[PDB]
Amino acid sequence: EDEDVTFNDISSLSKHVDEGLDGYRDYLIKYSDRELVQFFENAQLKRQYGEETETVKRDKDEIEKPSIFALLPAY
Amino acid sequence: QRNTMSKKELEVLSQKLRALMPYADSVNITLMDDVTAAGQAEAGLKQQALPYSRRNHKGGVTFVIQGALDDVEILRARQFVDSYYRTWGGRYVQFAIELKDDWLKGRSFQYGAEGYIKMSPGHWYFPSPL
């Protein structure tokens, strides 16, 4: 709702919308199991970029804002 | 080449050896050529088709035989070495025989002056000029 001027153009709008969802990504991430989140992320990378892409093994991790379609079934 | 002694000195040396060996009537001193020694060593390794590298120093020659060697190569090598040693002794030429695995354990690398090792796809190591 916030009425203050905030966006001007396509990149600023897409960033404004994306930024508005972090309040809920933080929730899903706080209760999802790290191992499952990692599995569903790697298995998407191997769909898009090809299975030869390096298997990440982010064993010590800051999971880089994972996609919500990957994050939701892990929760 | 390596000795610069006069005949008198050689005679004195001879007499002292004769005093150390009370069972010997005399000691004959003969001068041998280093180039001959080194040549007979290298020709023997070629004659056995062994892989080797040669290194030269002020006072000795080292032949380094190393890598993955077949049983036949190991046998031939030890036979020849034992034969040569019995003739010249271990004082000027040395043979080093070492079994090695793959140099870098079976992984890809660049061997230029700016070489590096791929630990895994996506992982570079830059340890040293390879």
Provide the CATH number for the domain around residue B70: 3.30.70.1770
What SS3 state is found at B93? Answer: strand
Per-window interface: B 91-130 vs A, CB < 8 A: 120-123
What resolution in angstroms, rounded to 1 decimal?
A: 3.3
Per-residue tokens: B54: 């040669």
Compute chain A's Rg from CA coordinates: 15
3-state secondary structure of B34: helix
Smallest Cα distance from A56 to chain B, Å:
10
Angle at A52 between CA A18 and CA B106, to 5 degrees: 135
Distance CA B67, CA B99 (A): 5
Q: Does A51 touch chain B (CB under 8 A)?
A: no
Q: List CB contacts (< 8 A) between A54 and chain B.
A: 120-123
Question: How far apart (Å, rounded) are the C-alpha atoms in residues B112 and B118?
Answer: 14
Answer whether B122 sits within 8 Å of A54, measured CB to CB: yes
- Laid out side by side, the sheet with B93-99 consists of B53-57, B60-67, B93-99
β-pair partners for B123: B120
- Which residue of A lies nearest to B121 if distances are taken between CA atoms? A54
Nearest-Cα distance to chain B for A64, in Å, is: 18
**How many whole angstroms separate alpha carbon B64 and alpha carbon B94?**
9
Residue range(s) defining the domain that contains residue B63:
33-102
Angle at B85 between CA B84 and CA B90, to 5 degrees: 135
Token pair listed for B120: 């895994």
Going across the sheet that includes B116-120, the strands are: B109-110, B116-120, B123-124
